[model samples]
Target chain A: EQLTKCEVFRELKDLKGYGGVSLPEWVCTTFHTSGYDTQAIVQNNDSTEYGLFQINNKIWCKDDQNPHSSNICNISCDKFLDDDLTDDIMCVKKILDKVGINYWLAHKALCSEKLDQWLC
Target chain B: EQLTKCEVFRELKDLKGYGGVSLPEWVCTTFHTSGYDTQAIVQNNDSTEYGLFQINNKIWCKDDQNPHSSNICNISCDKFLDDDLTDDIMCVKKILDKVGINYWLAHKALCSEKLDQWLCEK
Candidate 1:
């Protein structure tokens, strides 16, 4: 079954390895959909679903066309400057930085209203 | 260097995007082990070890041949239906659900277990 945001945060509280990152509400919301599964597993150059939040190579890495036996996700996030792949928290932050939080809020509102209108 | 339950919890708290699921001691307990690292990279039709827990594909996903880009971990836990894969929790919870808490407690024991066990075992 699918999970809600509160449910996801509670789980996040148990994971290890990630240090100094903060969980954002919008990122949690994205996971509720299949957003996490939208990944690219890069194999010998063919990038495929990459992580829990399936970030593709095109989005995360540029030069690495081949998928070697490496934790690309962790590597990318850890070496953010080299590949431009930031941690999930920072990745989401970039979006908010670009559009501003108000844009997301308004977008959500518009979508919610449209759904309501459709239902009516 | 190793982590305790409290430290892991703090890290989990920092993970962007997981919702309400709670992390358990035992599951995270295993991750600290090379347990999560024991995964086998299965090729066309071979069942290999899997997950952050490095659960063997044989142990978790039984029938599927080939890697097939499957979230076998999610599926195995799904068969539990009552199972909660809430964000990151379910993946870690199954161990707690099964071993009943205390069993895993001492097996992996403390971070110093490795450093201590080696010296003690000698």
Candidate 2:
């Protein structure tokens, strides 16, 4: 399901400072990558991206097609396609903790400067 | 490793008030089912059950081979076969809360009585 800006905020607001990034930074990065769409699965890199966070199959998650992916999240990419954001958020926190906010690519390019756009 | 009854109790003692079942009842059920074997994976009908609790893929978790699953715990069935009970314990709590003590065949058949046999020493 696609989420409104306020809805995303409500979902992630309680996790301020999670992964050493403020909730706004997290939400802002999400806006750039997913446009608040929970079911987004985009093919961008050498692999596919899944879930609302656009987690990559090459490192963060596993996929049937990528035989050699690291799958740090220990989860199948399909889990990210569901409307429930619980697993997606947990996977995002793990990725953020390991690589920090820059992993999003969108974070450094579009999110870092205009953080206020995500706030309700 | 196969766990001693007390060992299972030590691990599960703190979880007593979380589920309606007493610690002894919970631990007793473990003995009858998995015998405390952490890596147990067995087939049940068209689906599979995994981990110490023998969690069924048809309800609690997702298995790649099983298309008809609810995955109430939102975890992969493979996650259960590992040594860590972190995820297993979490899923068990969900099961106990929802289905109560009767969910396990062993619990209803063997563990419902004489639960004191599984009680641990302090």
Candidate 3:
């Protein structure tokens, strides 16, 4: 479920920008977070982060586990891990709009500094 | 990438009908053709059919094989093979509009018959 650099870039370009964050910045964040892997997953303390952007189960998607989650996106976390990035893209946009670039640690570390390398 | 009978019906229900062909018939056609397999691919003489609907590569999708293809859907064949049936649904609708249910051999052979067998339970 991994995508090539150009492929990821192509899809990101469609967004243009999210809350003043450029497409390159978004692509840059994607690389730093998941290395362009759509199936990326990371287990947090009590929450699980999933997919290309590592959306959190506690806040973004439903995992149907012990504790109930916000599930702001009203979607199954597994949907984000699929080959199709359509739903992932939508969720990431919603995350960006609601939480801003600060929601992504990658932006604070690298994406915000240099984004030219990921320009499509 | 295979879906259950009810799962297939749930998705198909979104399209009430295409050119008067009901959703159950569409679901019925998918069963006879690919059994709800999203990665379904059948290679023909010079062309290939793909996805749940078995859309023809020569007419709807580009395969980039020996001879050139028309590619009416203007999409990569790989797109239809993915877990996402959104693209497949779109192409099937277009095919239904242009060629009708007769385009699919399964429709004539099986789907055209009974369709209530695959209905979803409440």
Q: Write the per-residue lDDT of candidate 1 for residues B37-110, one digit (tens) a residue.
A: 32323333344433333333343344355334344344552232221224334544443454333322222223
Q: Residue by residue across B11-103, what tens digits does model 2's lDDT show?
A: 776568666678888888777777788756544225555767888878898765464688898888767765667788888888878997688
Comparing 1 with 2 on TM-score, the higher-scoring candidate is: 2
CA lDDT, candidate 2, residue B30: 78
How accurate locally is residue A89 in candidate 2, as Cα lDDT from 0 to 100? 81
DockQ of each: 0.01, 0.01, 0.01
Tell me the fnat of candidate 1: 0.00
lDDT of 1 by residue, A97-116 (tens): 54443333423543333233
Per-model TM values vs. the true structure: 0.24, 0.48, 0.48
When summed lDDT is taken over every stretch of 10 residues in candidate 3 chain A, the lowest stretch is A105-114
TM match of model 3 to true structure:
0.48
